[PDB]
Amino acid sequence: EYPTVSEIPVGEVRLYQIADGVWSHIATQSFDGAVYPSNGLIVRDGDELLLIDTAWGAKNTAALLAEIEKQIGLPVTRAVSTHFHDDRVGGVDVLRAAGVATYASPSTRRLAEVEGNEIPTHSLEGLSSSGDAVRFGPVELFYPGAAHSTDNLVVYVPSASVLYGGCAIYELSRTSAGNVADADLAEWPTSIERIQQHYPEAQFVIPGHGLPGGLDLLKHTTNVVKAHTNR
């Protein structure tokens, strides 16, 4: 039932309700002659919504806001980008124009600026050291250490036992490393073990791209990273 990359036309966004007040958003982008899905999260915060990650570009993110308006009907008041790449910050300008307060760690904000990407406005304190966690409305934000990127955060929704890994967690059908240009391959398994140690109770683990699963996705990701290391 989870929407697959083959069912979403680029420019369109789907929502998938995981638990009471918890949804993933799924969009697609064309990249190098292939089409890739991408996930983010939506978490109900009283009578408002917290958005985790853009929908990978301005057009998709505008479509995301329209689909939230239509299907949920509560305002997106805050958004967090989990690292500085375009599948997470691309669309921040759209969100800001719509009155969404955008947030990222100071590490992510700096890297986005260096990369010429869109820059979330507000800085999230308390995430500078591996293993740091902070509460942000209805979620917990966790910096596990460098992995897919040096700034990558993961997000836990305690009420639903939902762990969103962003691009630091791969889906099971991904057997080779994705974009690792900005990755710390040497630290990535250690960072994943920090995630496992902090959220052993997680029931629903969402990768940055593709199908959700259980905590098996963490060991899967380590396997793929280590195999790539030994390439």
Ligand X SMILES: C[C@@H](O)[C@@H](C(=O)O)[C@@H]1N=C(C(=O)O)/C(=C/CCCO)S1
Provide the annotated binding site. Answer: 12, 47, 83, 85, 87, 122, 138, 148, 167, 171, 209, 220
d(CA 161, CA 108): 26
Q: Does 207 bind Zn ion (CB under 5 A)?
A: no
d(CA 109, CA 202): 28
d(CA 64, CA 90): 12
Residues 58-97 touching ligand X, rule: CB under 6 A, are 85-87
Catalytic-labelled residue, pool 25, 39, 53, 87: 87
- The residues, ordered by sequence, that sit 6+ positions from 100 with a Cβ below 8 Å of its Cβ are 51, 76, 77, 78, 79
Residues 95-154 touching ligand X, rule: CB under 6 A, are 148
Residue 101's binding partner among ligand X, Zn ion, none (Cβ under 5 to 8 angstroms by kind) is Zn ion
**DSSP E strands, 46-121:** 48-52, 76-80, 101-104
Q: Which is nearer to ligand X, 21 or 208 (CB)?
A: 208
Distances 39 to 32, 46, 182 between C-alpha atoms, Å: 19, 23, 20
Asked if 179 is an active-site residue, the reply is yes
Asked if 198 is an active-site residue, the reply is no
Q: Which of 167, 192, 215, 224 binds Zn ion (CB under 5 A)?
A: 167
Q: Which of 7, 17, 31, 226 binds ligand X (CB under 6 A)?
A: 31
Helices 188-198 and 216-229, packing angle to 10 deg: 170
Q: Which residues are catalytically annotated? A: 83, 85, 87, 148, 179
Note the residues at the interface with Zn ion (CB under 5 A). 85, 87, 101, 167, 208
